[PDB]
Amino acid sequence: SMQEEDTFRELRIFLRNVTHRLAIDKRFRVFTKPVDPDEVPDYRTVIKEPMDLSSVISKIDLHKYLTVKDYLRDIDLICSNALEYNPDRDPGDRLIRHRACALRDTAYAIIKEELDEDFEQLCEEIQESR
Numbered sequence: 001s002m003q004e005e006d007t008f009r010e011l012r013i014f015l016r017n018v019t020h021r022l023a024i025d026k027r028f029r030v031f032t033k034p035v036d037p038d039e040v041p042d043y044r045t046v047i048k049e050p051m052d053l054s055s056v057i058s059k060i061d062l063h064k065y066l067t068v069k070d071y072l073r074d075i076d077l078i079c080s081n082a083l084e085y086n087p088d089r090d091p092g093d094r095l096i097r098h099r100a101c102a103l104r105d106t107a108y109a110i111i112k113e114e115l116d117e118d119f120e121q122l123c124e125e126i127q128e129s130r
């Protein structure tokens with residue numbers, strides 16, 4: 001229905017605004033664009049599903065996310081990729097991991113304060129009906 005397409009358009013506006021607020025934060029610079037294979041050639045031998053904030057905006061615009069849960073699966077993948085690729089004790093790995101955990105925790109905290117729980121339940125019930 002037209003009502004349903006209006007629901008999904010509001011979801012996209014909300015996701016673009018959360019993603020923009022993450023992308024301008026200086027702590028999250030190394031998560032804003034895909035890893036360059038001609039700077040880190042080993043990356044794609046270890047990490048089987050790369051993800052970054054520029055790819056997330058592209059996915060919003062392609063109508064890939066029908067719920068906030070499917071968006072948070074990609075924010076979780078950005079954070080889990082960094083914990084797996086940079087697991088060592090040295091300061092450079094520990095700084096990347098601390099920033100990855102902060103990106104994940106910031107996304108969840110914005111959504112807890114700003115997403116209405118009945119708006120998410122509506123999106124889940126439309127998705128299940130298709």
Ligand SMILES: C[C@H]1CN[C@](C)(C(=O)NC2CC2)CN1C(=O)NCC1CC1
Nearest residue numbers: 029030031032033034035036039040096
């Ligand atoms: C995920 C981040 C952090 N971990 C990596 C291994 C790294 O340390 N890369 C060193 C800088 C070449 C890979 N990576 C990037 O390449 N980000 C590129 C920024 C977005 C433009």
